Design a binder for this molecule. Structure first.
Ligand code: MG
Ligand code: MG
Length: 247
């Protein structure tokens, strides 16, 4: 019950080094006017990553469009439920054709007034940029983060771990998924930054904060983010949702 005008910008890019974009991103709006942004990073050889990412985003968002709710707790019930049905829908689909290792990350973000609530599965990320500073909101579901949490690495040690991130859960797996949820307040001038790993593997947090500090449109800033990610190497698909909170 605190109306803020908010600008949303979506962009996806294949990257310099890849010939297939298995990321998917889209926005939706339910019958009560509540926007939802869904970003998904798919994995799996010849089109299994494409299918999983586009299916999750399209199915959830199409179901979202038919809903009625305007409260956080109702939206939260919806996220926990829909993600489990999509998890078993993609696993089943992974089994019945021979799709080796089909799965996707998810970030699902709904904006109620000036609050956001997210559901998060994988190594995609959500951050807030305020007064030139990036605040990380999600924790990567990765091998190195499990080692920290069990007391086998320090946080400093994981930051310089030499192996690539092996994901520990994704949508389309046999066991039920455990998504992370979070409610946060957005302040005037903030930027919500929702991205797949292709942004943040190539750019530092402060680099992202730098791009968004300029006086340019949101759409131009999002273009600058992927251009920079490509200049740094572009080794993976880059996909970003930006939300700016108007003053
Ligand atoms: Mg992928
Ligand atoms: Mg990726």
């Amino acid at each position: 019950a605190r109306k803020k005008y908010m600008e949303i910008s979506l962009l996806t890019d294949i990257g310099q080094r890849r010939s297939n974009n298995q990321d998917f991103i889209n926005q939706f709006e339910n019958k009560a006017g509540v926007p939802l942004i869904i970003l998904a990073d798919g994995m799996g050889g010849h089109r299994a990553g494409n299918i999983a990412s586009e299916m999750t985003v399209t199915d959830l968002g199409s179901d979202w469009a038919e809903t009625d709710f305007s409260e956080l707790s109702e939206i939260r019930d919806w996220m926990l439920v829909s993600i489990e049905t999509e998890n078993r829908k993609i696993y089943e689909l992974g089994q019945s054709d021979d799709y080796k290792g089909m799965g996707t990350t998810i970030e699902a973000v709904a904006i109620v007034g000036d609050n956001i609530i997210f559901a998060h599965v994988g190594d995609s990320r959500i951050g807030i940029v305020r007064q030139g500073e990036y605040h990380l909101l999600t924790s990567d579901h990765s091998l190195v983060n499990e080692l920290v949490k069990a007391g086998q690495l320090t946080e400093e040690e994981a930051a310089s771990h030499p192996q690539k991130n092996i994901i520990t859960q994704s949508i389309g797996q046999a066991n039920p998924v455990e998504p992370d949820l979070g409610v946060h307040l957005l302040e005037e001038g903030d930027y919500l930054v929702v991205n797949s790993d292709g942004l943040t593997n190539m750019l530092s947090n402060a680099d992202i904060a730098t791009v968004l500090t300029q006086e340019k449109t949101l759409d131009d800033k999002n273009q600058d983010l992927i251009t920079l990610a490509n200049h740094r190497g572009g080794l993976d698909n880059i996909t970003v949702a930006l939300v700016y909170v108007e003053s």
